[PDB]
Amino acid sequence: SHMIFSDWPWRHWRQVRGETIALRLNDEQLNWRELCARVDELASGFAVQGVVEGSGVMLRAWNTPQTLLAWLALLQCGARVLPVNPQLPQPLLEELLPNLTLQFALVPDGENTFPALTSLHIQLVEGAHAATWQPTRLCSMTLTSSTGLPKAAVHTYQAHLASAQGVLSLIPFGDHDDWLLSLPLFHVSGQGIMWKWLYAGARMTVRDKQPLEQMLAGCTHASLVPTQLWRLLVNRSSVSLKAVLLGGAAIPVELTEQAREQGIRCFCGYGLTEFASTVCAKEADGLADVGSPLPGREVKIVNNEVWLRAASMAEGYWRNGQLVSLVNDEGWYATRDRGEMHNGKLTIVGRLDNLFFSGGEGIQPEEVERVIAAHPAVLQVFIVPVADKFGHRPVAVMEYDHESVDLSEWVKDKLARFQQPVRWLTLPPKISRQALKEWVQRQ
């Protein structure tokens, strides 16, 4: 099922059924007409400050009502938007930004700290400024996460809409269903929610950060990482969810089973920044695979490495005004993910770069993590290399359901001797595996 847009999707739904509810901003509901009016106030505000088609704009901000509206207004001006996790350090950004062809910075909750960029403010002005709707126009620049410095993957509107199209051919999402903006707009996971909302013309909820169960009040849908869903199940929170899309890492069968117990229908996904989110997906079924590729997507394994094509692929990485192609000599994106293919379903083994050797035997931490995650009391589990006089050896860093449990015996009929953790630790108060290696070495 495809959706052909006459105009900006929000204006499209205004024309088709403007008086229907579109969005919750905290306790405030807006219909499509009201939403468009609010976007216009801002869009024109940005046009007055000199934002034009193709302007590079940094949006350093958390998920808030104000951030969402700023996104829709910037896009409506035809601006190339780079959303930025506010946690990223000042020095890092100074290295990135001059290559990203930006002339603007919008930092709504604080301060612009880049004199090279024109400080952009939130200004509500008449009347209705908007560029011409063009699917193939560059839409978003999204930062990767760490083989060094993060790259800026660039997507068109068409690619984001293609992402939503594929995902919604699997996940039912009715016109009165309400998806919680539950993940950052500076990641593709959060952007994907916005676009699935707009593709279906259903409802989205934006709430200020607060406990997730309260954020979810009246929502039918959400996109979550495993830890988030774990938090809901442990607390046994009263949530009314028709569907959860999971992704970002491997998804344990026991999470998914515990979700069904509590009336939460789960979908499992394999997605990447380079592909504007989900590529392979399925309804959860107790198996370890991540399902088949969605409509309009190809996967293949060469040398145990996952190679991808999709209509949701980025145009390229942005390098000082040029778009660097993502694909290799044969027109595929090489993910650096190790994976297998059986019955047309993909299994993700782990990241190539996370592989490490211990006494000659290769350890793939995700493989080991998957086994340990079977235990009922396990909540998080990371297998980290530590140096040894062996080369390296595996250490388990954990988070348990309620207080530690010793698994050094339980594991013996489940892991090879060389995969069993030397030490069993606790996670200190997406987690970077480099930071995780550095923390373990210092213990």
Contact footprint for ligand 4YB (CB under 6 A): 144-145, 188-189, 192, 223-225, 245-251, 269-273, 277-278, 290, 335, 337, 348, 351
Residues 39-58 that bind Mg ion (CB under 5 A): 39-40
Q: Return the residue matching tokens 């739904």.
A: 13
Q: Site for Mg ion (CB under 5 A): how many residues? A: 3
192 or 421: whose CB is closer to ligand 4YB? Answer: 192
Q: What are the structure tokens assigned to 373, written together? A: 């995650």
36 binds Mg ion (CB under 5 A): yes
What minimum distance in Å lies between the beta carbon of 6 and ligand 4YB?
A: 26
Residue 435, C-beta contacts closer than 8 angstroms, at least 6 positions apart: none
What minimum distance in Å lies between the beta carbon of 6 and Mg ion?
A: 14
Segment contacting Mg ion by CB under 5 A, of 31-39, 80-88, 204-212, 389-397: 31-39
Which amino acid belongs to residue 184?
P
Residue 178, binding choice from Mg ion, ligand 4YB, none, Cβ under 5 to 8 Å by partner class: none
Q: Identify the CA nearest to 177 among candidates 212, 195, 207, 202.
A: 202
* Pairing outcome for strands 56-60 and 80-84: parallel
What minimum distance in Å lies between the beta carbon of 29 and ligand 4YB?
A: 25
Segment contacting Mg ion by CB under 5 A, of 35-43, 241-249, 264-272, 303-311: 35-43
146 or 240: whose CB is closer to ligand 4YB? Answer: 146
What minimum distance in Å lies between the beta carbon of 143 and ligand 4YB?
A: 9
Residue 40, binding choice from ligand 4YB, Mg ion, none, Cβ under 5 to 8 Å by partner class: Mg ion
What minimum distance in Å lies between the beta carbon of 278 and ligand 4YB?
A: 3
CA atoms within 13 A on the CB side of 296: 21
Cα 285 to Cα 103, 107, 210, 251, distances in angstroms: 48, 43, 31, 11
Residue 165, C-beta contacts closer than 8 angstroms, at least 6 positions apart: 2, 3, 199, 295, 296
Distance CA 314, CA 384 (A): 32
Distance CA 162, CA 309 (A): 12
What minimum distance in Å lies between the beta carbon of 10 and Mg ion?
A: 6
122 or 352: whose CB is closer to ligand 4YB? Answer: 352
30 or 334: whose CB is closer to ligand 4YB? Answer: 334
Contact 108, 61 (CB under 8 A): yes
DSSP 220-262: SEEEE-HHHHHHHHHHT-----SEEEE-SS---HHHHHHHHHT
Residue 259, binding choice from ligand 4YB, Mg ion, none, Cβ under 5 to 8 Å by partner class: none
What minimum distance in Å lies between the beta carbon of 263 and Mg ion?
A: 37
Residue 269, binding choice from ligand 4YB, Mg ion, none, Cβ under 5 to 8 Å by partner class: ligand 4YB
Distance CA 188, CA 365 (A): 25
Q: Which residues bind Mg ion (CB under 5 A)?
A: 36, 39-40
